[PDB]
Symmetry: D2
């Protein structure tokens, strides 16, 4: 899976990456994995090399990453303490985070247009 | 694949749906396909039932769908005549179109934040 | 996933289909699922239509399917009673069960040749 | 895709890996790719490291790999010269080659049992 959808009451999923869960895609000889680790660090790996992280290892147990409806990605511990947030917020709406073939992780939104074909 | 990326100079793909190509995902035993047909109609199917279309069948040959850098999705023929465009545009930037598990097809953008981990 | 590997001491997986798990592939807009149901019946579905089954529903609880090292597929309950087995056995070795695009589910083995590239 | 099926008149596919085509699976931080290259060498790579090859680079152009009905995998050039064969043959039947999570590439067959649910 390549995408997390912002919290919303519909069956778009995933909306949460719990500990041990990840986005992953393949490019060439590279696996890119964006994973909420059991030590509370959310990391992007290119094969076994860490390329970017929230640097929150050791802050909590049972952490999850959630994308809020204003586009902010947060990591929250199992006691419900937010230990990291992305730094820019948008208008409330619907957003997606995508792990992309170019190795960038990008949050896009809000939604500009849709077919309106839910169901 | 579930996503089209807006035309841009990087290796995100796909950026064009040529004729016969599609996005496709599964929801249970339903297959959702968003396909650029040979007859120039761009159609969302739930299994074999058409649920939405640009209604452009017969209007051109050798058609493609592209997501422009202002977030407008267009269907263009092999003589470069645009025969359909979505109706709302945003600022120039990067956008994505996603076929979602809830059966909506949505354009999001522009990019709000990224890890900046290209390449 | 399209394949079950016979029980063996290496990291090939899956080697067991626990209840609710399945093999699944797509052929066009048909979904073929070979599922170990909660009611102990192991069933091949074409979409929502059952096309073959072990006819073991209600015979046990908490059932699993495993492919033994002689190529026999068995359904075993959570009290380790075998309630169904395929009818032909081969020599001990390594075998695979595959859900194939032609909608047949086939057990092959034992291994005839390999690159010998484990690990 | 993880499997090649032996040549047979049914729509199990793939039965041929043409030049540039490959099997690929992910394990952990590893991509394993088994690819018929444009230089006629059929290679198994673990990320960018070649781990095993037929050593047929430079023997031909437009080569393809085919799994015959007696279980022998061959590489054949676009002039139809066989330039490599696996060394053990079985009875004629149906076989499969699988690129496995343990990094072994294995041909299994002949078929021992099937549901007989073709269609």
């Amino acid at each position: 899976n390549n995408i997390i959808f912002s919290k919303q009451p519909d069956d778009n999923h995933p909306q949460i990456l719990h500990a041990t869960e990840s986005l992953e895609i393949l490019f060439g000889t590279h696996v890119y994995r964006f994973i909420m680790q059991t030590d509370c660090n959310l990391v992007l790996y290119d094969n076994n090399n860490p390329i970017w992280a929230t640097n929150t290892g050791g802050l909590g147990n049972g952490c999850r990453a959630v994308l809020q409806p204003d586009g902010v990605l947060v990591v929250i511990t199992n006691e419900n303490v937010t230990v990291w947030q992305s730094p820019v917020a948008g208008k409330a709406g619907h957003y997606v985070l995508v792990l992309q073939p170019d190795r960038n992780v990008v949050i896009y939104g809000d939604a500009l247009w849709a077919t309106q074909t839910v169901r």
